[PDB]
Design a protein around this ligand. Structure first.
Ligand SMILES: O[C@@H]1[C@@H](O)[C@H](O[C@@H]2CO[C@@H](O[C@@H]3CO[C@H](O)[C@H](O)[C@H]3O)[C@H](O)[C@H]2O)OC[C@H]1O
Ligand SMILES: *[C@@H]1OC[C@@H](O[C@@H]2OC[C@@H](O)[C@H](O)[C@H]2O)[C@H](O)[C@H]1O
Ligand SMILES: [Ca+2]
Length: 190
């Protein structure tokens, strides 16, 4: 159903839905691993389904409709603790590449595309443990897509090689993120 920001479990999948309070976002849980987000003139939000906690060898499948209009990402998305890390395996984005301004650290080939690897830092921002400073890890797919399979081990292993180490996993979902934009998406995870 349509729900307010929060986390929990639906139809055997963890979900997380977060927004910055701006308005203009509608998050809905569907049957099985499905969720939908429709947004119009939003702020920043992140929502999706998967697992709590994630693992470092999960093979994650996603399929659906992803129709951003503006700044938005479609990613395997999750956190670790000790160290506190927000990570992204970006499968699609709209008008803005999240690595713009970031230093490239390497590459990994996985699931039919090369990905570029970057580290960034968030300073005094919201997080799974409240206001914090923390690194983010990125794999950015060169050839976008809105359905597919992601072997997360390929990414985590490549990151690790580059000195990008993950701590104990927290949640791990397929998430739609928007950043002051509009769009519609409906994704089924497995
Ligand atoms: O991890 C997420 C970050 O990627 C996100 O950073 C914002 C991404 O959008 C940038 O704005 C773009 C600048 O370029 C053009 O002008 C675009 O139209 C803008 O959208 C912001 O500058 C970054 O802060 O922050 C949220 C975090 O979850
Ligand atoms: C964005 O950062 C905030 C994360 O959600 C918070 O998690 C910690 C809870 O105490 C807080 O109430 C939540 O808002 C969200 O998972 C990330 O996507
Ligand atoms: Ca795209």
């Amino acid at each position: 159903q349509t729900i307010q920001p929060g986390t929990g479990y639906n139809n055997g999948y963890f979900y997380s839905y977060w927004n910055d309070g701006h308005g203009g976002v509608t998050y809905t849980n569907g049957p099985g691993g499905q969720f939908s987000v429709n947004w119009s003139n939003s702020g920043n939000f992140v929502g999706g389904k998967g697992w709590q906690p994630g693992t470092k060898n999960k093979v994650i499948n996603f399929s659906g409709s992803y129709n951003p209009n503006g700044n938005s990402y479609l990613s395997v998305y999750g956190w670790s603790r000790n160290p506190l890390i927000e990570y992204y395996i970006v499968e699609n984005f709209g008008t803005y590449n999240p690595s713009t301004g970031a230093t490239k650290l390497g590459e990994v080939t996985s699931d039919g595309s090369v990905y570029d690897i970057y580290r960034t830092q968030r300073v005094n921002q919201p997080s799974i443990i409240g206001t914090a400073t923390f690194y983010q890890y990125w794999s950015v797919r060169r050839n976008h897509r809105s359905s597919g399979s992601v072997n997360t081990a390929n990414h985590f292993n490549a990151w690790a090689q580059q000195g990008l180490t993950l701590g104990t996993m927290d949640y791990q979902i397929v998430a739609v993120e928007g950043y002051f934009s509009s769009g519609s998406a409906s994704i089924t995870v497995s």
